[PDB]
Amino acid sequence: ARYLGPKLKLSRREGTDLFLKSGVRAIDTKCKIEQAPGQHGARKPRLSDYGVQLREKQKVRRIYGVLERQFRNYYKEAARLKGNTGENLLALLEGRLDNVVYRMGFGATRAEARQLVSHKAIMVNGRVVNIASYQVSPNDVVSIREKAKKQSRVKAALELAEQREKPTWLEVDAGKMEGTFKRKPERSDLSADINEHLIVELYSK
Amino acid sequence: MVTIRLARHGAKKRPFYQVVVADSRNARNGRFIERVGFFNPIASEKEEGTRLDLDRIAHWVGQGATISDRVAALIKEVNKAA
Amino acid sequence: ATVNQLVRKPRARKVAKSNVPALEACPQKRGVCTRVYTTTPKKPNSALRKVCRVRLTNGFEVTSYIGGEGHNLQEHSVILIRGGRVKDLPGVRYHTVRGALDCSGVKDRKQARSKYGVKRPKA
Amino acid sequence: NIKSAKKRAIQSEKARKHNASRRSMMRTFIKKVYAAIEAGDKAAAQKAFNEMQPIVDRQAAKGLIHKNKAARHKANLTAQINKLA
Amino acid sequence: FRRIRLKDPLKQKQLLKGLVQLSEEGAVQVFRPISNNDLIVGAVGVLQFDVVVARLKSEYNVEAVYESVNVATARWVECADAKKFEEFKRKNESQLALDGGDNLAYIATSMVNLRLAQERYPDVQFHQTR
RNA sequence: UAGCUAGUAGGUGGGGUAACGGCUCACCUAGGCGACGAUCCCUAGCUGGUCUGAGAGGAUGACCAGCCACACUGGAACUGAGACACGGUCCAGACUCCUACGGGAGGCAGCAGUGGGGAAUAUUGCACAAUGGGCGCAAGCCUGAUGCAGCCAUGCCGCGUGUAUGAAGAAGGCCUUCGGGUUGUAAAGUACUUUCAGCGGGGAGGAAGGGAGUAAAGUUAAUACCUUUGCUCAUUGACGUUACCCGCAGAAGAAGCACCGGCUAACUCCGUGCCAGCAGCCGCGGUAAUACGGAGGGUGCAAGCGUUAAUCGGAAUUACUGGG
Numbered sequence: 001a002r003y004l005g006p007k008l009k010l011s012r013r014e015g016t017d018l019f020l021k022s023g024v025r026a027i028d029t030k031c032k033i034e035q036a037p038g039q040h041g042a043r044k045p046r047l048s049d050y051g052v053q054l055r056e057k058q059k060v061r062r063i064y065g066v067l068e069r070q071f072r073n074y075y076k077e078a079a080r081l082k083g084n085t086g087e088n089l090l091a092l093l094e095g096r097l098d099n100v101v102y103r104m105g106f107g108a109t110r111a112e113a114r115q116l117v118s119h120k121a122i123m124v125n126g127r128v129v130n131i132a133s134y135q136v137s138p139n140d141v142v143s144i145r146e147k148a149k150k151q152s153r154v155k156a157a158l159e160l161a162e163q164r165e166k167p168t169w170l171e172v173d174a175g176k177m178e179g180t181f182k183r184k185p186e187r188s189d190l191s192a193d194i195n196e197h198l199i200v201e202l203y204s205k
Numbered sequence: 206m207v208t209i210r211l212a213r214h215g216a217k218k219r220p221f222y223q224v225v226v227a228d229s230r231n232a233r234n235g236r237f238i239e240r241v242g243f244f245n246p247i248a249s250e251k252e253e254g255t256r257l258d259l260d261r262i263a264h265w266v267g268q269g270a271t272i273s274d275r276v277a278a279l280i281k282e283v284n285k286a287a
Numbered sequence: 288a289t290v291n292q293l294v295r296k297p298r299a300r301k302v303a304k305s306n307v308p309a310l311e312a313c314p315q316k317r318g319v320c321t322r323v324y325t326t327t328p329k330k331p332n333s334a335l336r337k338v339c340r341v342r343l344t345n346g347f348e349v350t351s352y353i354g355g356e357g358h359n360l361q362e363h364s365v366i367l368i369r370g371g372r373v374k375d376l377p378g379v380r381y382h383t384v385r386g387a388l389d390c391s392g393v394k395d396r397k398q399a400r401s402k403y404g405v406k407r408p409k410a
Numbered sequence: 411n412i413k414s415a416k417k418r419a420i421q422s423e424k425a426r427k428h429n430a431s432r433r434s435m436m437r438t439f440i441k442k443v444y445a446a447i448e449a450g451d452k453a454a455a456q457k458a459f460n461e462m463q464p465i466v467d468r469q470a471a472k473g474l475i476h477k478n479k480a481a482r483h484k485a486n487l488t489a490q491i492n493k494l495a
Numbered sequence: 496f497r498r499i500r501l502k503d504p505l506k507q508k509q510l511l512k513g514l515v516q517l518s519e520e521g522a523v524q525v526f527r528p529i530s531n532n533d534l535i536v537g538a539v540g541v542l543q544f545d546v547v548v549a550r551l552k553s554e555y556n557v558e559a560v561y562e563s564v565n566v567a568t569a570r571w572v573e574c575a576d577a578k579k580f581e582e583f584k585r586k587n588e589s590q591l592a593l594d595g596g597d598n599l600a601y602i603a604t605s606m607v608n609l610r611l612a613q614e615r616y617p618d619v620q621f622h623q624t625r
Numbered sequence: 626u627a628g629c630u631a632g633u634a635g636g637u638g639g640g641g642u643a644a645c646g647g648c649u650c651a652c653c654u655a656g657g658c659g660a661c662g663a664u665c666c667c668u669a670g671c672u673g674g675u676c677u678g679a680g681a682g683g684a685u686g687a688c689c690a691g692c693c694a695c696a697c698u699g700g701a702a703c704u705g706a707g708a709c710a711c712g713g714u715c716c717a718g719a720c721u722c723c724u725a726c727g728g729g730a731g732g733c734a735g736c737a738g739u740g741g742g743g744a745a746u747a748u749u750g751c752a753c754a755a756u757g758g759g760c761g762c763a764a765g766c767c768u769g770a771u772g773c774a775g776c777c778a779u780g781c782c783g784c785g786u787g788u789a790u791g792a793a794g795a796a797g798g799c800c801u802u803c804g805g806g807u808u809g810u811a812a813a814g815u816a817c818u819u820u821c822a823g824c825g826g827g828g829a830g831g832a833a834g835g836g837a838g839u840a841a842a843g844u845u846a847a848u849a850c851c852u853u854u855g856c857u858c859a860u861u862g863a864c865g866u867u868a869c870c871c872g873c874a875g876a877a878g879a880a881g882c883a884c885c886g887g888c889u890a891a892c893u894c895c896g897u898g899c900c901a902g903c904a905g906c907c908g909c910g911g912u913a914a915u916a917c918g919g920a921g922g923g924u925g926c927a928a929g930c931g932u933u934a935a936u937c938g939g940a941a942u943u944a945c946u947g948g949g
Contacts, residue, residue, distance in 0.1 A: 001784070001927075006811080013924095023789085038923060039807065040892060054890075068926075108789085115788065119820060130820075131783060153789085153817085205939090213756055213771085218868085220831070222756080233757055233770085236691055246755095246831070275756080278833060290945080295660095298943055300683090307934085314934040315744050319505075333899050333911085344743080356901065356918075363504050367744075369933045374904075384933085387744095389504065391531050397919065399903095401882060401931045409588040411712060411731085419713060422704035430703085473706095476643055486639085553740055577878090 001067070007111070013037040014059045016193070023108050024156055056198035063194070064093045065110055070133070075203045086196030087187045094185050097122070098132035100142060104172045104179045105161020106154050121148035136181055143178040150177070206230075208271045209262065211244065212237075220246055224257070224276055226265050244279060257283050307370035307380055310345050315384065316368045318343040323353070323360045328375045336376055339383070341368055351381035355393040355403050364389035429474055436469045443487060452495040459491055496543055497564045499534040501557060510534075513554050517546065518595025524625075526570060527593035528602075535566060537595070570600040571609065575619040583617060598624065 003010075007020040008031055015034050017027070035041060045051065061071055078089035093099065098114045101122055107113035116122060118130045124142045136142075144154065154177060161172070169185045172178075187196075206229045213233055215221035222244045227237040242257035257279060266272070272280070309316060318341035325335045337353040339360060352373045353360070360366075367387035373379045386392050386404015396405040439462040446455035463484065470477040499514075501507060514536075518525035523546060524537030536546060543561070550557060572594065575583065584591065590602050601612045 004787085006809090008810080009923095038891090040923090050889085058890090112788075115818090115820090118784075119818075133783080151817090211756065217773085218831080220755090229758075232690085234690065246833095249830090273757090275833065288944095288949085293945080298945090300943055309934070312935050313744070314932095317744065331899095331908090334902080335900075336902090354903085365504055365507075371905075371933075374906085374908085382933090388507075389532070393918095395919080399883080399931090407881085410585045413712075416713080418704070422714085425705095426703050478643070479641085482641095 002111070002114070003062075003065075004111075007109075009037070010062045012041075014055065014062070016059065018059065018063050020062065020109060020111070022110075022160065024160060050202075053198045053202040056195050057202055060093075060194055060199060064096070064099065065114065065132075066093070066096075072203070075199070086200055089196055089199065090187065090190060090194075091184050092135075094190060095136045096132055097124070097129060097134040097136055097142075100136050100170065100179070100181065103167060103170055104142065105158045105164065106144070106177065106179075108157040108160055112153075112157070116153070119148075121145060138181065138183060140181040141178065142181065143176070206271065207238075207265070207269065208273060209265060209276045210273045211275055222246065222275075224279065226270060229271075244275075255279065255282065259283065306372060308347065309370060310347070314369070316343050316345070316349075317365060317388070318349070318351075318368055320351075320360065320364065320366050321362050323362065326376055326379075329377065332375060338376060338379060339366075341366070341381070343368065349381055350379050351383050352376055352379045353383050355383075355385050357394060358390055360390060366390045432469060432472075433474060436466055436475075439465060440483060440487075443491075447490060447494070450494070452491065455491045455494060459487060496536060496538045496541075497561050497566075499536060499559050500532075502559060503557060506556070509554055510550075510557050510559075513552075514546075515595060517549070523595075525595045526600075529589065529591060529593075533564075537570075566603065567605060568603045568609070570594075570603040572598050572600045572624050573617060573619055573621065574598060575617045579618065583615065596624065 010020060011018045012031055012033055015037075017033075021028065057071075061068070064071075066074065074092050075085075075089060078085050078092055081088040098110060098117050101107060101113040101117055102110050106122070107116050114132050117132050120128055120130060121144050122129065122142065123145050124134070124136070124140050128145065144150075158174065158177075161174075167185070167189060169182050169189070171180045171182065173180070207226060208229050209224060209226050210233075212223035212225050213220065214223050223240060224242050224244055225237045225240045227235070231237070239261070241261045242255075244255055244257075248254035262280070320339050320341045322340035324338060326338045328334055328336055337358065338350055339353055340348065340350045342348055349368065351368050352375075365388050367384040369382050369384050370380070371382055373382070383390065384404065385402075392404040392406070396403060397408050400406065439458075443455060443458040443462055446458050449455075466475070466480045466483060467477075469475050470480040499510065501510070514523070514525050514534075517523040518537070522539060526535035526537060528534070536543060547559070547561075549555060550559065570592070574580070584599075591599050592602050594600060601608070603609065
């Protein structure tokens, strides 16, 4: 299920910062980014259309931590909704529970947030959910139970939440660790860089 | 002989009965005339637990349908003055 | 065009024959596997390819290409037959399954071991 | 086959004479009236019809005849005996 | 004693099942080497004509006439405790043999190999199965 | 496969069917089907549906459900409202078994299980606790249907096999222009945690009913009997050492499979040398192999991964949409 391997080599492979190794520390520059994905990083590829589509797909997948079959299921759930497919797909990727826990600042990295969800700590609407594939409904409230509240691992990782953009579509209390979910995010609000059009052109065939 | 009985739908360890008018010689999930209402035994307190249209049931009582014990208990659940 | 011709004689779809006559769509077949010898291929190859004439259990006489490096076949040792043409031996339309029945696996293989039936390197 | 409910077999044996024997005597009375049809005597035909009518209605009563076979017998036999008379 | 070499090699499955049925018994314990041929019939007695007559049944049709092949001393069954028999499997991976009941004794060709096995120190929660 | 049909086509009358009916008999005429495929051969249970496909279409219809047909083979009738009958009868045939040899018993295309076939498919398990069916006023009885339990990664889904930190950028392997790089925050070390397994304790829900007693209203001459409704008591679980919750201990028990010339994601070194060999197509190997084998590294999926077999799409290469 999980990758559980070189989460720093993937950002070198894609070139952009995938935020897998975020941590308490800032931008590292400790792995020679953009110039060494591996042994043959000095090579310049031909980089065709299917190439940039597959690199965009793997980039979005290793940002959001979703496997291939599960992301194909998310695309099937994106093509059936209203509006357009590309906005719906990123709304479904944001509607994952671990991504909401990550945007709240409850954990430094995304895998740490997934481990915090999994080990009976994250509770939404009074009902504890361990699997990160929970589709977050609008107008919910996420928090941490009292038996797992502030054993320091939420605490210092919350300080990283003071350095992030702190987006509009969700609000954290930061006094009792009780988040509040709100309306669905606009396309022009989430990270401003990733391309849904290559994902649509890949999964259209 | 016609009867009003449950049909036992659902999954394993997840029962969901279908109160339905059918002949006694037909199968439990077999051929039926028409369906009327439903019952869920695991329907602890939420927005809906049991729908039961008493008009068609009274019509089949006017035809001669033998009501089983669970359907009679559902009739005593859907009480005229309660 | 000329739709009345299709009214009289409808457009009959061609029923293309299968590349492997494997008796009503089965994955594998089990044969007697006689006649173990080497076959020199067609013009731009110039090699010596091992082959075996496999009398199947349904009566058909097929000839399957012996894969792998080394084998223990001598007119016997019932094996398993899989489909697929070889494109190097005209007349051969099948392959031998290694790791299957009596033909044992290929000695000292590490890479590509699910094909050719070799186990994981134990040491 | 060995069965606890084999009693329905031999009891049907107990049926296959007796009821059929009644059926037997029923049709012979019917055939007797056909003898009158081969005789030409309308008085003997009426006497035979009056002899066969209550017994064939009794055979229609006891579940052997579905009172439409015997009704057909009464109908066409009445038609024959008043066509002859 | 000797072997199984499977005359009339069609339908090995009657002996790949039906002799494993006899392998649980006190007289017969079938030994499977890795090379998938030359399966050893275990006998504690001498007269293996019992199994040869037993090979002529409803689910037994293969003959396997005997000859002389030398495998010597009894295959002393031993299954050591965890984290330690793994490297014992790794160092001589061509010198193992499956048994009746999924066991691995060592392999018994001579007394000197059993002395090397005792020199190898296999600390074991020992069960004889015999 | 171009002619087929003689109860054949229709009519009158008799009989027969729960019922129209050449369904069946006596008489009369020569009709009836057919190129908008009659008769003959092969194949096939049909359908709602499944898979694929934008749609139109194509294959399939295994599991759920309706109908039909069958119960070792063929034929026949009786009982019964309903059978021309799975666990009913008789006759004829084939195959096992008993015989005291005069004669009889049997039909797993039921649940289990076995021989053989095949590449391929399970346990000779628990109980009527719940539903339904049969009988009984009822209590109660049967139920291999069912509710489950055991096995199989057969398919889908989820979780874990640790997390954070950690440079001497250690040892070993591989490459080298022998400067160094790669494996590699990977491993060792340190600090926490134990999801899931192991053990020890609580513990729902699937449970409605039914039995005894009491009270009230009907019924009746009757405060007696019986029906119905409150109400009191003892209760009804195969699953079940249940789901779920708490506690103990220790990272402790838990990661493989394919690919690396292009299609299509990923590179070198060594060993042969048109030999061994790979391959789904272009194809490689003839002493400097990014294609064979081994080592290292990377990529992809993940308790699954590759190969084989089948259907559809791509294939507008069956063109009705949509070709010449």
